[PDB]
């Protein structure tokens, strides 16, 4: 049953993704879980801030940040180009199962429902949603999420694309310089028709 999960794990010890281009190293932890459910994939994604430059994003009234995941024809995470710099893997307890993967192809967005290089079907490559940032004074600021599936490939080796962009444009900054502790986004779940195994 454990073969049906593809996740980064739960709270990896060290930062494993680089969202802000300004960061010279990993600036947060991207927790992502993809689960096969019949003809769909259930994606479950959120971010935990680590670097100070990332956690300070809670102090700005208008912010936006994007995580881009690119996978080759076999579904392996292209670490050199993607935002998540730790290869995905299966479930072993609450961690990644160290070992090779062969059925990754099943988890990627289907190239049919979400075609590359086609303007006429462009609109069908976008999912939209909202998460929440919980404030230190116990508020819930809504964060708009826009997900784009494989509708553009930057490089030749790219065979599947998943770009998740968080943003907010609010009235009062969620936190102040002294009260700001970390940027943890409430879990976002979305669904996409999966590619054939």
């Amino acid at each position: 049953d454990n073969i049906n999960t593809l996740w980064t794990g739960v709270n990896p010890t060290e930062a494993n993704c680089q969202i802000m281009n300004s960061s010279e190293s990993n600036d947060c932890k991207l927790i992502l879980t993809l689960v096969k459910t019949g003809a769909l994939v259930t994606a479950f994604v959120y971010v935990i801030g680590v670097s100070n430059n990332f956690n300070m994003l809670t102090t700005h009234r208008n912010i936006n940040f994007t995580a881009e995941l690119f996978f080759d024809s076999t579904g392996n995470l292209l670490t050199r180009l993607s935002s998540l710099k730790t290869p995905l893997n299966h479930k072993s307890g609450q961690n990644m199962a160290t070992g090779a993967i062969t059925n990754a192809k099943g988890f990627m967005p289907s190239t049919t429902a979400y075609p590359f290089n086609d303007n006429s079907r462009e609109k069908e490559n976008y999912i939209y949603g909202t998460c929440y940032y919980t404030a230190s004074d116990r508020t819930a600021f809504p964060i708009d999420i826009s997900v784009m599936l494989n509708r553009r490939a930057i490089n030749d080796e790219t065979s599947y694309c998943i770009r998740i962009t968080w943003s907010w444009n609010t009235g009062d900054a969620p936190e102040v310089q002294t009260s700001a502790t970390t940027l943890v986004t409430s879990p976002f779940t979305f669904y996409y028709i999966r590619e054939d195994d």
Partner: peptide, 17 residues
Amino acid sequence: VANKAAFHKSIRSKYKP
């Protein structure tokens, strides 16, 4: 215009300045 004390969590994130 905003009150001197910070708004309550009920209307914070609904405040449109």
